[PDB]
Amino acid sequence: DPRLYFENRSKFIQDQKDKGINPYPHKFERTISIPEFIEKYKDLGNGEHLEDTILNITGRIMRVSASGQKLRFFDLVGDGEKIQVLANYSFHNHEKGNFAECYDKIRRGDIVGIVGFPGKSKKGELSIFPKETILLSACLHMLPMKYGLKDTEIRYRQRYLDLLINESSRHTFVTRTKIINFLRNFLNERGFFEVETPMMNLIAGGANARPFITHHNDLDLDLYLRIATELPLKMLIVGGIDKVYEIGKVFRNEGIDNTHNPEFTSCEFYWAYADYNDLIKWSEDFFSQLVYHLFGTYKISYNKDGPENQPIEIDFTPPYPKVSIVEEIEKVTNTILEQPFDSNETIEKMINIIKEHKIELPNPPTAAKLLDQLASHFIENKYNDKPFFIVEHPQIMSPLAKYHRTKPGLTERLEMFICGKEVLNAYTELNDPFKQKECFKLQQKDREKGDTEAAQLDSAFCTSLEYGLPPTGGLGLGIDRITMFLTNKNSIKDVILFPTMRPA
């Protein structure tokens, strides 16, 4: 019973203190790490001992067994690697205490420090042969086995148990950090300058989403958490930082599911004198090279339908297909979506397409939401075997994107999808301040109908446009979703160390 277990262990701690022993020593000076130990002594022969080499090593005990009264065996793990501990009565320093009393105390989970020599057992298992083993920090609960952590929510609420017991968990999070490292180096090598912009602002603009609100007490001031980094980054382009980017958290106050956590990690970059076509190329270069950097090939396996179903192969070899959103919806639905797309007639037509196909009506049935819903069900799963771009979005869906230089009513916008999930959003940046105020005014008229995700107008941002924003191309990436596909995860909670959870 776990509860009695914990109580006996706590009593043990107290009783050890009462006898004069410190169960939590301040410092043990380690000589070698467990990965270093494996590298150095892997080449030893079966049964070879180096008894003149005395080492101080630490780690977490993960298995306890005995062979008689003079032999105790353990697994010792550290930094994701494992060695055996072979405690023989014949090598024990009896001046430190009784052998059996010393090792009877150890439990699965204890952190220990060992003074001993390296070698391999007769079977051939690389081992540390202790002369003395010291408790550094007890595990007071029973550690679960892999089956206890398998199909549970414990991994999200006690991530440390997952990291200790599931080898795949460590690897997922190492890949996540490698992906971010690769992206930072990719941009820095191309002259980009990393900055930090405020997470708390008077307005939350740069995307269409409901924000979190907070309050600064001394200023008696309500502030919004940022939903995107787009607006202050473009003001820095005005300021002459012509290649600027930010990798950090944004906050969106909306529904939670397998591809939505309320805080998530984005990268946005802004590139003065680039356009749509440079951004398409950047995306293909970046994703193809990232995948090759991680896997040595451009093709990966992904269990789109979970581990109980067949996986699919995703090929990141460029180029990727491009699909124009309005043209394709018109072809697949056999309708003509007349401009203005936000006219009453086009809105009624899109509603009827949705109702005819038994699709859910967006809670406010705005033209921009109607089109999004249509693309979701008719386009975004056109390709699963390769990423692809949906391109040339209407201006009503894209209030900060520059008008399309040859197609009226559209913009120079691209979104990349992997397995039906949006991972990238980019466009030629709107830089005419007179057209920008018009877009914000139209977004206000859409807010008046009950749209809580209509981005609010930023007076400071519009003012910065009046000092001259050069022609610019900007791009944003969803780091968590990218990591999901590159670690074979179906849930954003599997690639975030501490996902947003209700209290226990």
Ligand X SMILES: N[C@@H](CCCC[NH3+])C(=O)O
Ligand Y SMILES: C[C@H]1CCC[C@H](C[C@H]2Cc3cc(O)cc(O)c3C(=O)O2)C1
Going 295 to 299 to 305 to 308, the CA torsion angle's sign is: negative
Token pair belonging to 126: 């690389």
Query: Nearest-CA neighbor of 117 among 61, 67, 58, 56?
Result: 56
For residue 420, the minimal CB distance to a copy of itself (Å) is 22
- Could you tell which of a copy of itself, ligand Y, ligand X, none binds residue 160, using a CB distance below 5 to 8 A set by kind? a copy of itself
Nearer to a copy of itself, 91 or 212 (CB): 212
The whole-angstrom separation of Cα 443 and Cα 282 is 30
Among 169, 197, 201, 261, binds ligand Y (CB under 6 A): 261
Q: Which of residues 451-480 bind ligand X (CB under 6 A)?
A: 474-476
For residue 422, the minimal CB distance to ligand Y (Å) is 5
Q: Which span (284-292, 312-320, 327-335, 422-430) binds ligand X, by CB under 6 A?
A: 422-430
Number of neighbouring beta carbons within 10 Å of residue 173: 19
Question: What's the Cα-to-Cα distance from 267 to each of 247, 346, 350, 455, rounded to whole Å?
Answer: 4, 35, 33, 20
Among 103, 224, 264, 440, binds ligand Y (CB under 6 A): 264
Asked if 477 and 186 count as a contact pair (C-beta separation under 8 A), the reply is no
Token pair belonging to 463: 């003012």
Token pair belonging to 265: 């990690």
- Could you tell which of a copy of itself, ligand X, ligand Y, none binds residue 178, using a CB distance below 5 to 8 A set by kind? none
- Assess 425 for contact with ligand Y (CB under 6 A): yes
Establish how many alpha carbons lie within 13 A of residue 297's alpha carbon, considering only the half-sphere containing its beta carbon. Answer: 6
For residue 421, the minimal CB distance to ligand Y (Å) is 8
- Could you tell which of a copy of itself, ligand X, ligand Y, none binds residue 104, using a CB distance below 5 to 8 A set by kind? none
- Could you tell which of ligand X, ligand Y, a copy of itself, none binds residue 36, using a CB distance below 5 to 8 A set by kind? none
For residue 464, the minimal CB distance to a copy of itself (Å) is 6
Torsion of CA 121, 126, 128, 129, to 10 degrees: 10
Q: Which span (125-133, 195-203, 251-259, 380-388) binds ligand Y, by CB under 6 A?
A: 251-259
For residue 400, the minimal CB distance to ligand X (Å) is 6
For residue 122, the minimal CB distance to a copy of itself (Å) is 30
Query: Nearest-CA neighbor of 113 among 97, 128, 98?
Result: 128
- Assess 197 for contact with ligand Y (CB under 6 A): no
The whole-angstrom separation of Cα 131 and Cα 117 is 8
Q: Which of residues 245-284 bind ligand X (CB under 6 A)?
A: 268
- Could you tell which of ligand X, a copy of itself, ligand Y, none binds residue 375, using a CB distance below 5 to 8 A set by kind? none
Token pair belonging to 137: 């920090």
Among 252, 402, 413, 493, binds ligand Y (CB under 6 A): 252
Nearer to a copy of itself, 272 or 371 (CB): 272
- Could you tell which of a copy of itself, ligand X, ligand Y, none binds residue 422, using a CB distance below 5 to 8 A set by kind? ligand Y
Pairing of strands 71-78, 111-120: unpaired
Total residues binding ligand X (CB under 6 A) = 12
Report the residue closest to ligand X, judged by CB. 476
- Could you tell which of ligand Y, ligand X, a copy of itself, none binds residue 478, using a CB distance below 5 to 8 A set by kind? ligand Y
Single-letter residue type at 274:
A
Nearer to ligand X, 115 or 274 (CB): 274
Report the Cα–Cα distance between both ends of the chain, in Å, rounded. Answer: 21
Asked if 298 and 284 count as a contact pair (C-beta separation under 8 A), the reply is no
Read off φ and ψ for residue 481, nearest 5 degrees.
-65, -40
Nearer to a copy of itself, 336 or 504 (CB): 504
478 forms beta bridges with 266
Give strand ranges (E) for 331-438.
Answer: 388-391, 413-418, 421-428
- Assess 422 for contact with ligand Y (CB under 6 A): yes
Question: What's the Cα-to-Cα distance from 94 to each of 51, 65, 72, 98, 100, rounded to whole Å?
Answer: 17, 21, 15, 6, 11
- Assess 480 for contact with ligand Y (CB under 6 A): yes
Query: Nearest-CA neighbor of 464 among 134, 238, 193, 309?
Result: 238
Nearer to ligand X, 399 or 474 (CB): 474
The whole-angstrom separation of Cα 174 and Cα 448 is 46
The whole-angstrom separation of Cα 377 and Cα 92 is 69
Nearer to ligand Y, 73 or 156 (CB): 156
Asked if 298 and 292 count as a contact pair (C-beta separation under 8 A), the reply is yes
The whole-angstrom separation of Cα 16 and Cα 10 is 10
Number of neighbouring beta carbons within 10 Å of residue 46: 11
Q: Which of residues 77-106 bind ligand Y (CB under 6 A)?
A: none
- Assess 60 for contact with ligand Y (CB under 6 A): no
For residue 232, the minimal CB distance to ligand X (Å) is 11
- Assess 426 for contact with ligand X (CB under 6 A): yes
- Could you tell which of ligand Y, ligand X, a copy of itself, none binds residue 240, using a CB distance below 5 to 8 A set by kind? a copy of itself
Asked if 454 and 446 count as a contact pair (C-beta separation under 8 A), the reply is yes
Nearer to ligand X, 211 or 474 (CB): 474
Among 112, 128, 179, 207, binds ligand X (CB under 6 A): 207
Among 119, 130, 206, 399, binds ligand X (CB under 6 A): 206
Q: Which residues bind ligand X (CB under 6 A)?
A: 206-207, 228, 230, 268, 425-427, 429, 474-476
The footprint of ligand Y (CB under 6 A) covers 252, 254, 259-261, 264, 266, 422-425, 476-478, 480-481, 492
